[PDB]
């Protein structure tokens, strides 16, 4: 393993106090996408002075960021004491595809002390430490944030010249304070600045040794450290998790003024990560000599696409988050940073359709008691089981089983049991697990040429098992048996033609087979008459040892209907609110497993009833004739189309919902059309809606002048009037 | 090892103890399972369940192994996959450089080449480096190198 070098002295571990409500400050940092802030550069490759779009990890341009501030600790007068901290211990959060993240920020300013906050400390950079791996869990004393088996850990050491990476296991002390401990608080690590930090003596354990006193090093499978040098500007460091392990983005070692990510360094730790936490750390610093630090943010990153304005300097100067807004999209969707100024479209309102009702059953179970006993049959003597107008719960069918092959086609493994349908069938026969290489649906072996075939119109879910000891109402046949000839000899007794059995049926020659083959090879003929169109029947079959637990084979199979609907899984509906009138939205239904969304009212029936769902031309359901003697007129969904007014001159636009009216349009929306409409909000913040004749607008001024050229037309006599000329 | 083993189970039964949900391997990567799964299947149908805590989303995970008898001489798999980079194309085949023209100036023609894995043929110059540097291969709009 790593040289990890010394141990702890101490068993114990300087106690930590939860101080966080001293660190609460309102400082946030919404993403700048238009001066590229949070930008990784791409992977190796760069472009020239033009724009172009990407798409890849990116913080999202609406977000101000999560903010983290570390201090100093206890101190009083002349001295350090114990750990004065936030809670960034109990901090779990998801690891969320990469971030990240602005350090020294705030840095060259003033600010506070946070813990001792009435000195008004001046700011100062300061580098944060991180934890993060696939697993996490509570300590002894219920305390978040223990992580279990191998870590990744982030720590600067002593001064932000030295940073370590590491990958290796914690181990817990068990002495005053400490992980194990039961005296233990919270977990911190901490700088002595007052020995550490020597111009002299840089101490490149301090807080690595400040971290031991917490846990042991075990395990040390990876290290490394880098040599770093002090600068108060803000830097943007980014991570991201990859199958070529975690990569570091950093302007840092690049773009000290363009704030661009490159690719400082990378990882060979191979482990997901499914946690990310900030690590507490403290100052020991004297009390008379207390500073304050710069605020630290980070911002997750998501597959986000971006309009990018490289300049000459290879430097992502400006980017368009594609999707923040309806403006954005269309500068995105015309690649360049000026749209010209006109009258367009952009996406429409999905109108928020509300939680769902169902009109499913009632019925009775679908009992599946006939596969409970008895010898089941040769794959050319199927036994079929139909349900109609019932109930189940497959899973406890299931049990009943060792399932050794779950195999299916056109639908999931799970949808199968999920789905309500017209009929559930069920094909079952004994099949041993040496042949039972010659069932699926594309065989094209003798069982599927003389036995069994299954027609490609429904899905099909294929199972065998094999019978539990404990299932002694099951009997099993002697040997495994079937058909592996069925052909038919010409009356001249030369030529010959095979009968192939068809989809979801008995071959012809059943009639002349015994129920099982008696003797492999067992072969029988039958004269055809005349009224037979004259020939030979011929036939023949073979065997299979019987097995010590009985081998069975399954072919399920289901039919979707229209108002046949009736085989569903046993309802949930209980404890649930009244369905399925509400009436109300466009609900999204299930009805007797007819599903899709829409707009009810009670409605004058149409011909024909009890045939339930009435449908249209292009299938699209008229109205339903509901079984509370209401025919339901489906009115739909609907869709507020929205188009967006610039005038580039002026910068400034407005907006149309038209027919929609303003009865459905307020100051704020959530249907959507897109995640923030903010570019209209930079005036309608504090504007309404207006009415107008083409329909609800917001943006514009009721001036009701009279324009000799429009511009910028809105059809009939309606106006775009410019905004107030340059 | 004493048997070639392998995961035939891994799966998380849901907290109410009746349906349950099967956690298939991502690609080159471990299944969640590994964790409880010991080093070596050490008997054919060995199974191993972990109770999924509220911070796990509840649950039981599930788990279970296969074996196969040690064979005289080591059988063995391997998996070998390359990713093509940009200015990152630094795994290469021992160069036969040896004995060889002067390269890569020449220019020449349209020269034929091979820069770093980079290949294809084209007219060079020395002129104007443009930004940004350290990252080798510029290319333009519709990916077709700069220079």
């Known amino acids: 393993y790593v040289d990890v070098g010394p141990d702890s002295v101490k068993s114990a571990c300087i106690e930590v106090d939860?101080?966080?409500?001293?660190?609460?400050?309102?400082?946030?940092?919404?993403?700048?996408?238009?001066?590229?802030?949070?930008?990784?550069?791409?992977?190796?490759?760069?472009?020239?002075?033009?724009?172009?779009?990407?798409?890849?990890?990116?913080?999202?341009?609406?977000?101000?960021?999560?903010?983290?501030?570390?201090?100093?600790?206890?101190?009083?007068?002349?001295?350090?004491?114990?750990?004065?901290?936030?809670?960034?211990?109990?901090?779990?959060k998801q690891f969320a595809n990469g971030f990240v993240v602005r350090i020294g920020a705030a840095a060259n300013s003033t600010g506070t002390v946070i813990i001792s906050p009435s000195t008004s400390a001046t700011i100062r950079k300061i580098y944060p430490a991180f934890m993060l791996g696939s697993s996490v869990g509570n300590f002894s004393d219920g305390k978040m944030g223990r992580f279990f088996n191998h870590t990744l850990v982030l720590l600067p050491d002593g001064c932000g010249t030295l940073l370590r990476a590491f990958y290796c296991i914690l181990e817990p002390r068990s002495g005053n304070h400490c992980p194990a401990g039961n005296s233990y608080t919270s977990f911190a690590t901490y700088h002595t600045p007052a020995t550490?930090?020597?111009?002299?003596?840089?101490?490149?354990?301090?807080?690595?040794?400040?971290?031991?006193?917490?846990?042991?090093?075990?395990?040390?499978?990876?290290?490394?450290?880098?040599?770093?040098?002090?600068?108060?500007?803000?830097?943007?460091?980014?991570?991201?998790?990859?199958?070529?392990?975690?990569?570091?983005?950093?302007?840092?070692?690049?773009?000290?003024?363009?704030?661009?990510?490159?690719?400082?360094?990378?990882?060979?730790?191979?482990?997901?990560?499914?946690?990310?936490?900030?690590?507490?750390?403290?100052?020991?610093?004297?009390?008379?000599?207390?500073?304050?630090?710069?605020?630290?943010?980070?911002?997750?990153l998501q597959p986000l696409t971006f309009l990018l304005d490289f300049s000459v300097d290879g430097y992502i100067r400006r980017a368009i988050d594609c999707g923040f807004n309806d403006l954005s999209q269309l500068h995105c969707s015309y690649e360049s940073?000026?749209?010209?100024?006109?009258?367009?479209?952009?996406?429409?309102?999905?109108?928020?359709?509300?939680?769902?009702?169902?009109?499913?059953?009632?019925?009775?179970?679908?009992?599946?008691?006939?596969?409970?006993?008895?010898?089941?049959?040769?794959?050319?003597?199927?036994?079929?089981?139909?349900?109609?107008?019932?109930?189940?719960?497959?899973?406890?069918?299931?049990?009943?089983?060792?399932?050794?092959?779950?195999?299916?086609?056109?639908?999931?493994?799970?949808?199968?049991?999920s789905n309500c349908y017209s009929s559930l069938i069920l094909d079952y026969f004994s099949y041993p697990l040496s042949m039972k290489s010659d069932l699926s649906v594309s065989s094209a072996g003798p069982i599927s040429q003389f036995n069994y075939k299954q027609s490609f119109s429904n899905p099909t879910c294929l199972i065998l098992a094999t019978v539990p000891h404990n299932l002694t109402?099951?009997?099993?046949?002697?040997?495994?048996?079937?058909?592996?000839?069925?052909?038919?000899?010409?009356?001249?007794?030369?030529?010959?033609?095979?009968?192939?059995?068809?989809?979801?049926?008995?071959?012809?020659?059943?009639?002349?087979?015994?129920?099982?083959?008696?003797?492999?090879?067992?072969?029988?003929?039958?004269?055809?008459?005349?009224?037979?169109?004259?020939?030979?029947?011929?036939?023949?079959?073979?065997?299979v040892a019987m097995t010590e637990q009985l081998q069975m084979g399954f072919g399920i199979t289901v039919q979707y209907g229209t108002d046949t609907n009736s085989v569903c899984p046993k309802l949930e509906f209980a404890n649930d609110t009244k369905i399925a009138s509400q009436l109300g939205n466009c609900v999204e239904y299930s009805l007797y497993g007819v599903s899709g969304r829409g707009v009810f009212q009670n409605c004058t029936a149409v011909g024909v009833r009890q045939q339930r769902f009435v449908y249209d031309a292009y299938q699209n359901l008229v109205g339903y004739y509901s079984d509370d003697g209401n025919y339901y007129c489906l009115r739909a969904c609907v869709s507020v189309p929205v188009s967006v007014i610039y005038d580039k001159e002026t910068k400034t636009h407005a907006t149309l919902f038209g027919s929609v009216a303003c009865e459905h349009i307020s100051s704020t929306m959530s249907q959507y059309s897109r995640s923030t409409r903010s570019m209209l909000k930079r005036r309608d913040s504090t504007y309404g809606p207006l009415q107008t004749p083409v329909g609800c607008v917001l943006g514009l001024v009721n001036s009701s002048l009279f324009v000799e050229d429009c511009k910028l037309p809105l059809g009939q006599s309606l106006c775009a009037l410019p905004d107030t000329p340059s």
């Open 18 to 92: 939860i101080q966080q409500t001293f660190f609460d400050k309102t400082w946030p940092r919404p993403i700048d996408v238009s001066k590229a802030d949070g930008i990784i550069y791409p992977q190796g490759r760069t472009y020239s002075n033009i724009t172009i779009t990407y798409q890849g990890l990116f913080p999202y341009q609406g977000d101000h960021g999560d903010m983290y501030v570390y201090s100093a600790g206890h101190a009083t007068g002349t001295t350090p004491q114990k750990l004065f901290v936030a809670n960034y211990s109990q901090d779990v």
């Open 196 to 300: 550490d930090c020597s111009d002299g003596n840089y101490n490149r354990n301090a807080s690595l040794n400040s971290f031991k006193e917490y846990f042991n090093l075990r395990n040390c499978t990876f290290m490394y450290t880098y040599n770093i040098t002090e600068d108060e500007i803000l830097e943007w460091f980014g991570i991201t998790q990859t199958a070529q392990g975690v990569h570091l983005f950093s302007s840092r070692y690049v773009d000290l003024y363009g704030g661009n990510m490159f690719q400082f360094a990378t990882l060979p730790v191979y482990d997901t990560i499914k946690y990310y936490s900030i690590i507490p750390h403290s100052i020991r610093s004297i009390q008379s000599d207390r500073k304050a630090w710069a605020a630290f943010y980070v911002y997750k």
């Open 337 to 417: 940073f000026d749209v010209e100024s006109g009258v367009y479209s952009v996406s429409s309102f999905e109108a928020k359709p509300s939680g769902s009702v169902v009109e499913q059953a009632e019925g009775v179970e679908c009992d599946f008691s006939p596969l409970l006993s008895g010898t089941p049959p040769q794959v050319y003597n199927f036994k079929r089981l139909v349900f109609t107008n019932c109930n189940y719960n497959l899973t406890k069918l299931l049990s009943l089983f060792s399932v050794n092959d779950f195999t299916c086609s056109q639908i999931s493994p799970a949808a199968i049991a």
């Open 473 to 543: 109402t099951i009997t099993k046949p002697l040997k495994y048996s079937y058909i592996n000839k069925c052909s038919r000899f010409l009356s001249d007794d030369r030529t010959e033609v095979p009968q192939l059995v068809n989809a979801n049926q008995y071959s012809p020659c059943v009639s002349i087979v015994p129920s099982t083959v008696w003797e492999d090879g067992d072969y029988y003929r039958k004269q055809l008459s005349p009224l037979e169109g004259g020939g030979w029947l011929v036939a023949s079959g073979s065997t």
